[PDB]
């Protein structure tokens, strides 16, 4: 969707890889983020797969 692409442009241009890896490594932080954003579970899965592809690069 377009909202996933907005999270992608936001995570690339405004978040450090140390802050992004602290989110992908800590499930407590991740759960707090998706609940705060009110993401449907399928978009939260797509976004986590996308942010893992981006963080490894």
């Amino acid at each position, epitope marked *: 969707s377009i909202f996933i692409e907005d999270y992608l442009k936001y995570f690339q241009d405004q978040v450090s890889r140390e802050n992004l890896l602290q989110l992908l490594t800590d499930d407590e932080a991740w*759960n707090g983020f*998706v*609940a705060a954003a*009110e993401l*449907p*579970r*399928d978009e*939260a*899965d797509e976004l986590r797969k996308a942010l893992n592809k981006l963080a490894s690069h």
Partner: antibody, heavy 121, light 108 residues
Framework: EVMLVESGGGLVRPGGSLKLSCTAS????????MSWVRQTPEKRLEWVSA????????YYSDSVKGRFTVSRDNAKNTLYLQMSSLRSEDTAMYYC??????????????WGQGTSVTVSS | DVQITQSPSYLAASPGETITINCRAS??????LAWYQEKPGKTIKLLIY???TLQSGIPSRFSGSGSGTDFTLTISSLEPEDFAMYYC?????????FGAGTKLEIKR
């Protein structure tokens, strides 16, 4: 043995108020998100409201938003549903249900026996 | 709101037969669909969640399939205790929505 008991149901006039309550046992209530579901006389199931583990987030359906308010007391192991501006459309059997803890929104793995509410002049 | 189209509304079957209840969503929900059994007198029971995860205690003859938009609940070799009311539900997002129900009745 998980136990969900709801009470406070009854007869109410259109425009009136009512406070349903649900006491839980057999599990640590403070670690679980809860939902309110209702079954109409036409037998349709309809999700009403939900409250998070520690009251941080509340959720309501379109038909009920602004009139109903969900709340909980983890010390007293209770969940509540304050209802107001009641409509004949709210005549149903109301169930407190426990959600599975894999995501903030999830399937309902335990349901209570129900409490009947009737809105009529 | 995600709309769920559950079919058939009524289903006549005999014990030992295999049946399938269908469930279609108005938008993509991945595997996030649950199935419930409602019998008169007893509480509402969760059979499956996340499309195909069988809930603990439920017999292996209840089997869920599908992902994305179309789902199916299959009951193989029907037992007399399975003639009841079945409901699907999406648990992908709030508001949690339900299908209209399927009454599984006894053929004669």
């Amino acid at each position: 043995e998980v136990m969900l008991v709801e009470s406070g149901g009854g007869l109410v006039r259109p425009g009136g108020s009512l406070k349903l309550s649900c006491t839980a046992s057999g599990f640590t209530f403070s670690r679980c998100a809860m939902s309110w579901v209702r079954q109409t006389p036409e037998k349709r199931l309809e999700w009403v409201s939900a409250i998070s583990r520690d009251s941080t987030y509340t959720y309501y359906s379109d038909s009920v938003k602004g009139r109903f308010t969900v709340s909980r007391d983890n010390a007293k192991n209770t969940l509540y549903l304050q209802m107001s501006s009641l409509r004949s459309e709210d005549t149903a059997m109301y169930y407190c249900a426990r959600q599975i803890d894999d995501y903030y929104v999830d399937a309902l793995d335990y349901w209570g026996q129900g409490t009947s509410v009737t809105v009529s002049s | 709101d995600v709309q769920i189209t559950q079919s058939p509304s009524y289903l006549a079957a005999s014990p030992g037969e295999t049946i399938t209840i269908n469930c279609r969503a108005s938008k993509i929900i991945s595997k996030y669909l649950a199935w419930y059994q409602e019998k008169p007198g007893k509480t509402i029971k969760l059979l499956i969640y996340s499309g195909f995860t069988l809930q603990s205690g439920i017999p292996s003859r209840f089997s869920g399939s599908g992902s994305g938009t179309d789902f199916t609940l299959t009951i193989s070799s029907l037992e007399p205790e399975d003639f009841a009311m079945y409901y699907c539900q999406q648990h992908n997002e709030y508001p949690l929505t339900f299908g209209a129900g399927t009454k599984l009745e006894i053929k004669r």
